[PDB]
From a paper:
Although the structure of Tt121836-123 identifies it as recognizably part of the pilin family, it exhibits a different fold topology from Tt122238-123. The first β-strand is formed from the loop between the α-helix and what would be β1 in Tt122238-123. Formation of this strand may be assisted by a disulphide bond which links the loop to β2 in Tt121836-123 (which is β1 in Tt122238-123). This location is similar to the conserved disulphide observed in TTHA1221 and Tt122238-123, hinting that this may be a common structural feature of Thermus pilins. The structure also contains a second disulphide bond, which links β2 and β3 in the equivalent location to the D loop. Both Tt121836-123 and Tt122238-123 form 4-stranded β-sheets, but the location of the strands is displaced between the two: a short α-helix and β1 in Tt121836-123 are formed in place of the loop between the α-helix and β1 in Tt122238-123; β2 in Tt121836-123 aligns with β1 in Tt122238-123, and there is no equivalent of β4 from Tt122238-123 in Tt121836-123. Our results show that TTHA1218 and TTHA1219 are closer in structure to T2SS pseudopilins than to other type IV pilins for which structures are currently available. In P. aeruginosa, the type IV core minor pilins, FimU, PilV, PilW and PilX, are clustered in an operon; determination of the crystal structure of FimU revealed close similarity to the T2SS pseudopilin GspH, despite the low sequence homology between the two proteins. This work complements our observations reported here, in that we have identified two type IV pilins from Thermus which are most closely related at a structural level to two other T2SS pseudopilins, GspI and GspJ. To test whether Tt121836-123 and Tt121933-236 could plausibly form a heterodimer, we modelled both structures on to their GspI/J counterparts in the GspIJK structure. Inspection of the structure suggested that its formation is plausible but would require two structural changes to alleviate minor steric clashes.
Type IV pili (T4P)1 are long, surface-exposed filaments which extend from the surfaces of bacterial cells. T4P are composed of both major and minor pilin components, although major pilins comprise the majority of the pilin subunits within each fibre. We identified a cluster of type IV pilin-like genes within the T. thermophilus HB8 genome, using the program PilFind. Three of the remaining six, TTHA1218, TTHA1219 and TTHA1222, yielded crystals of truncated forms which enabled us to solve their structures (designated here as Tt121836-123, Tt121933-236 and Tt122238-123).
Numbering used by the authors: 44 to 125
The structure:
Amino acid sequence: QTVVREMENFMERLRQDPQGIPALCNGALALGGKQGTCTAIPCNVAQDGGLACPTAGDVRAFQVVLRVEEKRLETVVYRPLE
């Protein structure tokens, strides 16, 4: 499936650009010829690595949900310590 492959490529593109995610993953877009959407939820990361999405405080990672028709792909992109 072309759509699944494109969703993975785009997701990898986001994973390389965590500081760009608020702009690059911000509503509707086309992938593999179909309309879909990207949503990025800011998450906290505990000292033990536990994830809180959405965050009540610091944004240390994003929960990214890419949706194209019924297909869906969710991952976590961690932000650099800086």
